[PDB]
Design a protein around this ligand. Structure first.
Ligand SMILES: CCCCCCCCCCCCCCCCCC(=O)OC[C@H](COP(=O)(O)OC[C@H](N)C(=O)O)OC(=O)CCCCCCCCCCCCCCCCC
Ligand SMILES: CCCCCCCC/C=C\CCCCCCCC(=O)O[C@@H](COC(=O)CCCCCCCCCCCCCCC)COP(=O)([O-])OCC[N+](C)(C)C
Ligand SMILES: CCCCCCCC/C=C\CCCCCCCC(=O)O[C@@H](COC(=O)CCCCCCCCCCCCCCC)COP(=O)([O-])OCC[N+](C)(C)C
Ligand SMILES: CCCCCCCCCCCCCCCCCCCC(=O)O[C@H](COC(=O)CCCCCCCCCCCCCC)COP(=O)(O)OCCN
Ligand SMILES: COc1ccc(Cl)cc1C(=O)NCCc1ccc(S(=O)(=O)NC(=O)NC2CCCCC2)cc1
Ligand SMILES: Nc1ncnc2c1ncn2[C@@H]1O[C@H](COP(=O)(O)OP(=O)(O)OP(=O)(O)O)[C@@H](O)[C@H]1O
Ligand SMILES: [K+]
Lengths: 151, 97, 285, 364
């Protein structure tokens, strides 16, 4: 029921489940992902910056093919750094997703055990099973790629 | 492996009362725990391969740009002008998808 | 790239709304499992013989006044084979619940050997009692481990006799697969296999203190199995507070509560005394 | 991009709690009963498959005469501005084509020439001048610094056109303004209807009373009251009319519909044998096919325009067993009406049965 309460909770993100999920695999597995992402994006900007500098600096002096060796070295080193950071980021994202899924499932199963009989009798069996199948599948094979794509 | 684990979890959830009373809360939780460990050791490979896919999709275009630009230097005689370089980068970004 | 943002953001919103369910589940917790550090650990020989009555048993496992007891006590003597007669006012909710303090014990408990049932770790207490199902509950996996995963002495000594002791399954001794079992099925003979497995589990542990309930069939084969159980399970003095749809707890009734409706009156007794006190419940069916 | 193309994991998503336990199927989301006439006195049906009779150009004029004062001024101004502009363009084109623009430019370069013997319209040399000339011909100012000469007859044709079109527009706009001035008291309707209609007891018989009153100071001449019941009825031969309107008489000592309305009045209909509401009891008036319409008609003495005000009541609005508190109470030396107590109802004791049963065992 919306009641302007679930209505507002529908118009805006939860913003607290998201933070808990992001910080579930640890804290040094999060800042690593952000660090690598930001570095890779800045490098991908800087390579185009350097390409523009090289292209514009020698546009006029077509007969003079001088200083043609420094620019290429800069472009190649930037390309190598960009490729390495691209290789890093995907692995970091998937490692974070894997650890988060592991911890979530283990905690859920270790806290469902210490459950009162009134909880099991009152709560329909169908709901629990749906929670395990739907949440396990979504949190294991669906959230990492969505988060990576969004970022 | 997920289906196997789900069958085991439903078997340890449907018959819950006798389990709780008979001091067998952990005996039928360890089986699901072991099957869950199997599930993660099967899903790690999936995560590895999908990360590899993302890496390649992000990295092949930049390597293509690098090769296509370094090739001109040795291949050609005259300097390269922006009106071709930037058009070609836009063309690569159009072609990638 | 200005479209991927909104699309992926909405998708992430849906998925976070999904994980919110697990985040909600992890918050709740109840049914405290702990041990009150009983002196001498309450050695297993002490909660293995007889039973102790609960003084002023006032179980509050509901919001309304339970039909099982309204400030009503009970007389559970050593060997006090008990019974249940009635439909609604008499039930096995309080009996099974307070058997090992399972559903909301409030005012006292069974001080067996001077130590209360309540001040014991959940593990040992749940492993030092018994109960009956009143419904066939099967499992998956071989029947070898169902009784107990460490019953080395009895299972080895009685390879097929332990299962046979309650009821001799002849082809179980020589089956297609050694102690193989049909997962989640084969309920026909499993009706008696339930009794056999409960007897084995409580006999290897040498507990013998149970609270049965609601025999579903009571067929002639079930009657023979009951006779074998009495030879084995009820041969010991410690007997169960039997309940059933049909009143067959009066064959050896000793101390129970007559609870036709509303409350339970601890008045059931040997045949003549049971008939006098519980004439209404015995004359209903 | 391509969110869930891979579509393997389904057909085993277990039933939700509301699914298996059957808590969701308790819908209780029935649509409200369809009214025939709204509470705001506006009939709301949906006629369909009506053969469209097209439109007529008369409809644009009919709309033009009936417009808000905040649109009459705008169309007024736009029409005049557009006319001045159109004929300004015509005058500028005439000046261009005749060779007057060029002549004035050449004879103003050396302005000592000062020759204007052969020009369609004197002293028109740009488009600003053409605009000013069209303003002076349409509004009939006529300063006379830009004359109409007898030189080129195309100019005379345009002048005739402009005079006639200006007259047409002026006449139409004055007609619109005068019509809006004649309908100056014609604003709105101010007949106030009670919200709940009680079913009291009066002189030993039941009733169905509501309250009606005025707000406008102008009297209403020959007021008339009509009350109808809308329900689906079947003849013994079995023909079902979905919405049958049946007329119910109004209580009056001389059997008439004429109401004299200065102070608020109570309108009662007494539940006799032939009354549609003969066989309805207070316990039935919870769910019931019943809509009672009330229509009051008259003429406001100021404008002399007939007015008809409608309302409708359903089973929820009716307050069985109540009555109306006396709104009117004397002041120091003059009768007074406390209009804040208009729709307020008081509770009293009345039989719970139906008049169908209240006169088979009368001594109750
Ligand atoms: C391509 C071309 C582009 C063109 C662009 C747009 C050009 C627009 C230019 C002018 C725009 C003016 C719009 C202003 C809107 C204000 C309207 C204002 O007059 O409302 C006051 C009312 C409006 O009643 P209503 O809402 O229409 O409802 C109708 C009616 N009452 C009803 O309910 O059913 O109205 C009235 O009630 C009557 C008002 C009468 C006007 C007053 C005239 C004065 C004469 C009397 C002499 C007084 C002295 C005046 C001297 C002033 C000194 C300068
Ligand atoms: C909506 C507001 C209407 C405003 C339109 C007039 C625009 C300003 C006037 C203007 O442009 O001057 C020009 C009109 O140029 C035209 O002919 C424009 C005509 C467009 C009519 C717009 C209708 C809408 C003047 O052009 P000219 O008559 O050729 O000038 C003669 C040369 N001389 C001045 C050197 C002697
Ligand atoms: C809606 C339009 C009304 C327009 C009325 C104005 C007509 C101008 C008349 C005119 O000046 O005629 C003149 C030419 O000028 C012409 O060329 C006239 C051509 C006839 C115009 C008809 C258009 C339709 C003829 O002038 P004239 O030949 O010297 O006449 C001398 C003979 N007389 C002295 C007896 C008169
Ligand atoms: C009536 C509404 C008129 C609206 C303005 C239209 C006039 C613009 C076109 C004029 C034109 O076609 O040329 C004129 C001849 O055409 C004409 O005389 C006929 C005009 C046809 C359009 C109507 C020459 O004009 P001119 O011969 O007088 O100029 C030289 C004298 N020396
Ligand atoms: C986005 O694709 C492309 C991107 C680039 C290029 Cl060069 C080609 C394509 C392409 O060929 N695309 C196939 C056409 C296409 C596109 C987008 C989408 S979609 O809107 O993202 N997904 C949904 O609509 N799903 C609904 C909901 C459930 C099933 C019914 C449809 C769905 C289908
Ligand atoms: N004093 C008043 N002035 C103007 N309109 C009134 C007044 N009293 C009632 N009405 C009209 O009666 C209609 C129904 O109003 P509503 O149901 O809110 O209350 P009511 O039954 O009229 O009386 P009350 O307002 O005392 O409850 C409204 O359309 C309103 O315009
Ligand atoms: K003048």
């Amino acid at each position: 029921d919306n009641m302007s309460t679930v209505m507002r909770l529908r118009t805006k993100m939860p913003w607290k489940t998201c933070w808990w999920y992001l910080t579930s695999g640890g804290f040094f597995l999060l800042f690593l992902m952000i660090f690598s992402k930001l570095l890779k994006h800045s490098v991908i900007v800087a390579i185009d910056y350097w390409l523009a500098t090289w292209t514009s600096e020698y546009s006029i002096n077509d007969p003079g093919k001088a200083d043609q060796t420094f620019y290429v070295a800069g472009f190649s080193i930037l390309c190598g750094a960009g490729i390495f950071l691209c290789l890093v980021t995907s692995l970091t994202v998937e490692w974070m997703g894997l650890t988060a899924a592991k911890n979530l499932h283990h905690n859920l199963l270790n806290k469902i055990i210490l459950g009162p009989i009134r909880f099991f009798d009152t709560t329909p069996l169908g709901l629990i099973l749906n929670r395990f199948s739907a949440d396990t599948n979504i949190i294991d094979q669906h959230i990492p790629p969505t988060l990576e794509s969004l970022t | 492996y997920s289906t196997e684990r789900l069958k085991k979890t439903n078997e340890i959830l449907k018959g819950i009362k006798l389990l709780k009373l008979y001091a067998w809360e952990h005996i039928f939780c360890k089986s699901v725990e072991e099957t869950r460990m199997k599930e993660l050791s099967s899903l790690k490979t999936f995560a590895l391969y999908t990360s590899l896919s993302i890496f390649m999709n992000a990295a092949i275009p930049i390597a293509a740009v690098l090769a296509t630009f370094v090739t001109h230097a040795y291949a050609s005689g005259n300097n390269l002008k922006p009106a071709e370089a930037f058009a070609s980068l836009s063309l690569f970004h159009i072609l990638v998808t | 790239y200005l479209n991927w943002v909104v699309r992926n953001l909405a998708d992430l919103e849906v998925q976070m709304g999904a994980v919110k369910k697990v985040n909600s589940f992890l918050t709740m917790e109840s049914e405290n499992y702990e041990g009150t550090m009983d002196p001498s650990q309450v050695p297993e020989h002490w909660p293995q013989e007889g039973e102790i009555k609960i003084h002023d048993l006032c179980v509050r496992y509901e919001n309304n006044l339970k039909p099982v007891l309204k400030h009503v006590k009970a007389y559970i003597k050593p060997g006090q084979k008990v019974g249940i007669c009635g439909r609604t006012g008499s039930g096995k909710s309080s009996l099974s619940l307070a058997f090992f303090r399972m559903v909301d014990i409030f005012d006292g408990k069974i001080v067996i050997d001077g130590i209360d049932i309540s001040k014991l770790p959940l593990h040992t207490l749940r492993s030092r009692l018994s109960i009956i199902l009143q419904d066939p509950i099967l499992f998956s996996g071989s029947i070898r481990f169902n009784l107990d995963p460490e019953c080395k002495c009895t299972d080895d000594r009685l390879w097929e006799a332990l299962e046979i002791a309650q009821l001799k399954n002849m082809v179980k001794s020589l089956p297609g697969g050694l102690d193989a079992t049909v997962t989640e099925g084969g309920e026909n003979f499993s009706v008696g296999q339930r009794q056999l497995f409960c007897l084995a589990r409580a006999f290897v542990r040498k507990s013998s203190i149970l609270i049965m309930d609601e025999a579903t069939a009571s067929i002639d084969m079930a009657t023979e199995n009951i006779l074998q159980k009495v030879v084995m399970t009820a041969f010991a003095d410690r007997t169960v507070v039997t309940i059933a749809h049909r009143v067959h707890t009066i064959l050896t009734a000793d101390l129970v509560i007559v609870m036709k409706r509303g409350n339970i009156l601890e008045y059931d007794t040997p045949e003549s005394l049971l008939a006098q006190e519980d004439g209404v419940f015995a004359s209903f069916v | 991009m391509l969110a869930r193309k891979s579509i393997i994991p389904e057909e085993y998503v277990l039933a939700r709690i509301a699914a298996e336990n059957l808590r969701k199927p308790r819908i209780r989301d029935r649509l409200p009963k369809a009214r025939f006439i709204a509470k705001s006195g506006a009939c709301n049906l949906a006629h369909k498959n009506i053969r469209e009779q097209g439109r007529f150009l008369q409809d644009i004029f009919t709309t033009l005469v009936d417009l808000k004062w905040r649109h009459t001024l705008v169309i007024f101004t736009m029409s005049f501005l557009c006319s001045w502009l159109l004929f300004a363009i015509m005058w500028w084109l005439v000046a261009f084509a005749h060779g007057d623009i060029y002549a004035y430019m050449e004879k103003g370069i050396t302005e000592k020439s000062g020759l204007e013997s052969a020009v369609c319209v004197t002293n028109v040399r740009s488009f600003t001048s053409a605009f000013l000339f069209s303003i002076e011909v349409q509004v009939t100012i006529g300063f006379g610094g830009r004359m109409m000469t007898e030189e080129c007859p195309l100019a005379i044709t345009v002048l005739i056109l402009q005079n006639i079109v200006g007259l047409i527009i002026n006449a139409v706009m004055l007609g619109c303004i005068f019509m809006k001035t004649a309908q100056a008291h014609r604003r709105a309707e101010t007949l106030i209807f009670s919200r709940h209609a009680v079913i009291a007891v009066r002189n030993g018989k039941l009733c169905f009373m509501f309250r009606v009153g005025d707000l406008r100071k102008s009297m209403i001449i020959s007021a008339s009251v009509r009350i109808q019941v809308v329900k689906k009825t079947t003849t013994p031969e079995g023909e079902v009319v979905p919405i049958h309107q049946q007329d119910i008489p109004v209580d009056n000592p001389i059997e008439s519909n004429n109401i004299f309305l200065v102070a608020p009045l109570i309108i009662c209909h007494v539940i006799d044998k032939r009354s549609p509401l003969y066989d309805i009891s207070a316990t039935d008036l919870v769910n019931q096919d019943l809509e009672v319409i009330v229509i009051l008609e008259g003429v406001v003495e100021t404008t002399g325009i007939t007015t008809q005000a409608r309302t409708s009541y359903i089973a929820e609005e009716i307050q069985w067993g109540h009555r109306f508190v006396s709104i009117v109470t004397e002041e120091e030396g003059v009768y007074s009406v406390d209009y804040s107590k208009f729709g307020n109802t008081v509770r009293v004791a009345a039989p719970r049965c139906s008049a169908r049963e209240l006169d088979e065992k009368p001594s109750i």
